[PDB]
């Protein structure tokens, strides 16, 4: 039994205003003893919305660079994450790899760094369509696993987040089967490339298409431990969504 | 006469505790008259450092996307930067370019989108020591000039400065001749292609290596207008920099 897992990605939205009513929201939702729940505010809010947060709610942040300090005008460190109470980072969300060229190796690094410094990891990985289409789904999803796990040496405080990038905006969407397809593939690749026990004990979160509506049977697949949602989890929404096994 | 322009890039270094020690000896620092001093912090810390710093201190983020919301997990917009009570944004830092890959295209939508929202932009340009070698050290700032100047339609908002890449960790080092140099070849552009008002009145801030040793003959320069200070930023030195012209 792995412990269900929601965390909302806010992505790049939300001012002081619109997101302390949603924090009010989450602050007075009863959340269920055996749900972990993370949010990921903009860069901007980590500090005020952890803040804000009943403690109840970890804050992540939604990406980080790989070393402490530096001359890197626009980034910010594990170090400084924690530094404002956050204890998980988003790494190698389908965004920064596809709109910001952030490449596996990178990713990898950042994961290494982050980990070396304390926190939690949600690792994102996940095919387009082309991909899909020319049938390596498996290859893209599996090399993108497999350079996260070359820098993974704890698994502890690591979630795996599947992005059926390919049902983003496409004209396609995912059938909860299809999800539980892909998790199923990556437990297996854990089992065969790194060990049982890790595949046994990693969360591995769906990050497509979430809410109250669709919530409850995708939470049943055998292999879907949780969520990465998006835009409902700015809204009550997200509530529902804690409670999908409830 | 164009108001002495002095800018502190904290770039990705400090911590709550560090940079409140920072802060403190800002505030309590006397500026001069007539000079303008901004801080950016890392984007972790705008918000801690505005409602830290004396209001005669302005704060600025040292990079944002060019859309207001959406998603791009890892992003801020104008508007949050305003929301955190932030009046500047820095584009087109060289770490950005370099070592992150931002276009001249994409450095040219931010400022348009960051001008729109109402921020002010310290927009920054400059060569590599290849460029400066290959002696095309004007071609290169002129076009990156050029895509900044065709996204701006205020430039009471706007601050230009140029960091030589060249001479930044490579071994080479400016002489004050040498920014006096190009900052003259660069009011000449402004002049020649967007106005004699805009040439007059448009600070050309000098972002290379600035010590307090160096400081006072820099500003003495005729088209320096102040400074995009790094490292030396995270200093007491900083305020020997904002008395350069004292």
């Given at each position: 039994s792995r412990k269900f897992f929601v965390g909302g990605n806010w992505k790049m939205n939300g001012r002081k205003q619109s997101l302390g009513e949603l924090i009010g929201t989450l602050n007075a939702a009863k959340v269920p003893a055996d749900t972990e729940?993370?949010?990921?505010?903009?860069?901007?809010?980590?500090?005020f919305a952890r803040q804000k947060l009943d403690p109840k709610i970890a804050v992540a942040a939604q990406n980080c660079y790989k070393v402490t300090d530096g001359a890197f005008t626009?980034?910010?460190?594990?170090?400084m994450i924690k530094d404002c109470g956050a204890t998980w980072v988003v790494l190698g969300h389908?965004?920064?790899?596809?709109?910001?060229?952030?490449?596996?190796?990178?990713?990898?690094?950042?994961?290494?760094?982050?980990?070396?410094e304390g926190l939690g990891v949600i690792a994102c990985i996940g095919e387009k369509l082309d991909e899909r289409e020319a049938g390596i789904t498996e290859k893209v999803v599996f090399?993108?696993?497999?350079?996260?796990?070359?820098?993974?040496?704890?698994?502890?405080?690591?979630?795996?987040?599947?992005?059926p990038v390919w049902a983003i905006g496409t004209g396609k969407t995912a059938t909860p089967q299809q999800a539980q397809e892909?998790?199923?593939?990556?437990?297996?690749?854990?089992?065969?490339?790194?060990?049982?026990?890790?595949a046994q004990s990693t969360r591995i979160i769906y990050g497509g298409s979430v809410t109250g509506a669709t919530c409850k049977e995708l939470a049943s697949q055998p292999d879907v431990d949780g969520?990465?949602?998006?835009?409902?989890?700015?809204?009550?929404?997200f509530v529902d969504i804690i409670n999908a096994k409830q």
């Open positions: 729940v993370v949010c990921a505010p903009p860069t901007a809010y980590i500090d626009g980034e910010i460190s594990p170090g389908s965004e920064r790899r596809h709109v910001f060229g952030e490449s596996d190796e990178l990713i990898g690094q950042k994961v290494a760094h982050a980990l070396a090399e993108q696993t497999k350079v996260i796990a070359d820098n993974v040496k704890d698994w502890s405080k690591v979630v795996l987040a599947y992005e892909v998790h199923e593939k990556l437990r297996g690749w854990l089992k065969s490339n790194v060990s049982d026990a890790v969520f990465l949602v998006g835009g409902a989890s700015l809204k009550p929404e």
